């Protein structure tokens, strides 16, 4: 068809200029002349798009298409003397339909200035090696003979090198192997052997609580997850009980020494577990199952304090609403546990360290619950209704958070 601009827009323009009482044939005469000039320029701006080898366009093809038709490039003002603004363009006007049309000059200075990129640089790679396209990141994607393994000996040697580097004898070797896991596109069809190596490892690595072996395997899990190419939820049924035990298990190794390390490992386990519930989500299978196991870990009495601290951390890192609903009716039990560890003269065991870590973590989570959906007031002795664990020091932490909010 031949689509033109509407004539009922051309009469609005004419009567808002001082030219009143225009006929319909006078008004139809305006909207076929200007609709041709739009069609003449958009067909002529198409020349610059096809010779600019882009199709997408950069605000500027219409600026050269106008200059080609001996009409000035600038829009929003027309100079009848032509001399200060010749056919050089001014880049158009950054205007919108949902524009407020009113702005504060001070706000524009306040708004941050964007950074400037490195200048264009030249980088060569390989599309084809003697006919075959390589999988580099610059590329898009009764006697009978014995069977041949689908995995290659380069791939099997790669698996052996990556697994012997990921057990962390040297740190630079680990870090590359972790980046190699994080971005190898062909790491599918090797993924059963990696999942089995992880799963089997943690289970025979908690027989003796070897913390590095576990911290390296959890970093291997994290490096497996952020790889975008591979399909993981076929293997998550092996991945999730491995991270579960890491968080909810006792430490064969004494903890007064690496419990800080152990705590860090638990945090890593709780980070990956929250990611494992963020992805791979279907109805009522994964997130609710680990939530139920965490809550019955919490509810059961006389539970190892290492297991208690790990389950507390796992319950805490589950997001905004989960602590808004699951960390409310239980403060009295937490306080009673802290009071029991406090009473009595035996500190040799790990029960006291576990108690201090659990109380600190629970108190910080309470702080956003106090900040997110409550107003501060009576920060001296009202917390004694919650067994008086953090009290005024908790109030001081809340005040520091308020100061950080003021700085923001």
């Amino acid at each position: 068809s031949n689509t033109v601009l509407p004539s009922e827009s051309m009469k609005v323009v004419a009567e808002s200029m001082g030219i009143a009482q225009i006929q319909e044939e006078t008004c139809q005469l305006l909207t076929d002349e200007v609709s041709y000039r739009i069609k003449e320029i958009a067909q002529d701006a198409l020349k610059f798009m096809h010779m600019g080898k882009r199709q997408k366009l950069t605000t500027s093809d219409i600026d050269y298409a106008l200059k080609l038709k001996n009409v000035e490039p600038l829009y929003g003002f027309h100079a009848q003397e032509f001399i200060p603004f010749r056919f050089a363009s001014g880049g158009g006007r950054e205007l919108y339909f949902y524009e407020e049309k009113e702005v504060d000059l001070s706000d524009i200075i306040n708004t941050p200035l964007p950074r400037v990129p490195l200048d264009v640089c030249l980088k060569a790679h390989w599309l084809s090696i003697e006919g075959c396209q390589p999988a580099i990141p610059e590329n898009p994607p009764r006697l009978k003979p014995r069977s041949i393994h689908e995995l290659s000996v380069e791939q099997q040697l790669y698996y052996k090198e990556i697994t012997e580097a990921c057990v962390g004898s040297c740190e630079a070797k680990r870090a590359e192997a972790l980046q190699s896991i994080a971005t190898d596109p062909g790491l599918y069809q090797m993924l059963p052997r990696f999942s089995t190596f992880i799963s089997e490892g943690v289970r025979v690595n908690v027989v003796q609580n070897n913390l590095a072996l576990l911290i390296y395997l959890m970093r291997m899990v994290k490096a497996l997850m952020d790889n975008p190419t591979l399909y993981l939820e076929k293997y998550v049924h092996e991945l999730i009980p491995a991270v579960m035990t890491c968080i909810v298990s006792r430490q064969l190794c004494l903890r007064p020494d690496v419990d800080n390390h152990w705590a860090l490992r638990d945090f890593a386990a709780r980070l990956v577990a929250q990611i494992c519930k963020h992805f791979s989500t279907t109805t009522n299978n994964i997130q609710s199952r680990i939530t139920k196991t965490f809550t019955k870990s919490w509810v059961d009495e006389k539970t190892p304090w290492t297991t208690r601290y790990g389950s507390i951390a796992g319950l805490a890192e589950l997001g905004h609403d989960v602590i808004k609903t699951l960390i409310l009716p239980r403060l009295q039990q937490e306080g009673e546990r802290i009071r029991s560890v406090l009473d009595g003269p035996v500190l040799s065991n790990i029960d006291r360290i576990g108690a201090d870590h659990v109380q600190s973590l629970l108190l910080k989570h309470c702080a956003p619950v106090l900040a997110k959906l409550r107003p501060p007031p009576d920060n001296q002795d009202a917390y004694r209704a919650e067994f008086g664990s953090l009290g005024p020091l908790l109030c001081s932490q809340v005040v520091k958070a308020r100061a950080q909010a003021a700085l923001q």
């Binding site: 289970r203 908690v206 027989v207 939820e233 076929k234 998550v236 049924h237 092996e238 999730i240 009980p241 579960m244 035990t245 298990s249 791979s280 279907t282 299978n285 994964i286 199952r289 680990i290 196991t293």
Partner: peptide, 25 residues
């Protein structure tokens, strides 16, 4: 939709806590 392979995925049919040995023989 119950015919979808997602229902037959091992993770949906497998309980992780039961799978963990937890040093149990």
């Amino acid at each position: 939709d119950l015919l979808a392979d997602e229902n037959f995925l091992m993770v949906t049919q497998l309980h992780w806590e039961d799978d963990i040995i937890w040093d149990g023989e």
